[PDB]
Amino acid sequence: RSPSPVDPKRGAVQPRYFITTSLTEKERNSVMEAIQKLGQRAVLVEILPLNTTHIVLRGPPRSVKALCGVVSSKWLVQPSYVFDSLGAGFWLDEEVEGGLRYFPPPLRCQRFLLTMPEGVVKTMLQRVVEFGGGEVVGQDVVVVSSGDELLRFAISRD
């Protein structure tokens, strides 16, 4: 988060399709109202809607939707990205605002060995791996014992 206070860097003038994840109802409604107020080709719109480009979340990626965004090259931005852009009068540059985007998709065509017992956590991680174009092994493998390990792998590629 480092825009210039004089001439803050403008983001590209193009459609932005926002969803939110794991926000409180109050913060979600505030984010929605700000997106609608700023406009300028942004819209608040499967695990992710097929038209998703941006995911608003508070804090680091933790939910299934946030992890699917990490591995499918969506922008992951804090609520401040929306409120700061409304304050500037235009959509700010996502990277200057501290937004996260991992390109190309970091799990694509990679094989993952989930060294954990069966359960909802394993199931969710298999869904994330597949959402990112990877394969879960049922040798060139990435061993994962936690979602944190998969996340740290996904953000450290290229």
Numbering used by the authors: 474 to 518, 524 to 616, 626 to 645
Manuscript excerpt for this entry:
Kinetoplastids (such as Trypanosoma brucei), a group of evolutionarily divergent eukaryotes, have a unique set of kinetochore proteins that lack any significant homology to canonical kinetochore components. We previously identified KKT4 as a microtubule-binding kinetochore protein in T. brucei (throughout this manuscript we refer to KKT4 from Trypanosoma brucei unless stated otherwise) (Llauro et al., 2018). KKT4 has the following predicted regions conserved among kinetoplastid species: an N-terminal α helix, a coiled-coil region and a block of basic residues in the microtubule-binding domain, and a BRCT domain at the C terminus.
To understand the function of the KKT4 BRCT domain, we solved its structure using X-ray crystallography. The structure of KKT4463–645 revealed tandem BRCT domains. The N-terminal full domain (BRCT1) consists of a central four-stranded β sheet flanked by two α helices on one side of the sheet and one α helix on the opposite side. No electron density was observed for residues 463–473, 519–523, and 617–625, suggesting that these regions are flexible. Superposition of KKT4 BRCT1 with the N-terminal BRCT domain of H. sapiens BRCA1 showed a good structural match with an RMSD of 1.11 Å (for 65 Cα), suggesting that the KKT4 BRCT domain may bind phosphopeptides. The sulfate ion is coordinated by three residues in the pocket, T494, S495, and K543, which correspond to the key residues known to interact with phosphopeptides in other BRCT domains (e.g., S1655, G1656, and K1702 in human BRCA1) (Williams et al., 2004). Furthermore, replacement of K543, located in the putative phosphopeptide-binding site in KKT4BRCT with alanine, decreased the binding affinity by roughly an order of magnitude.
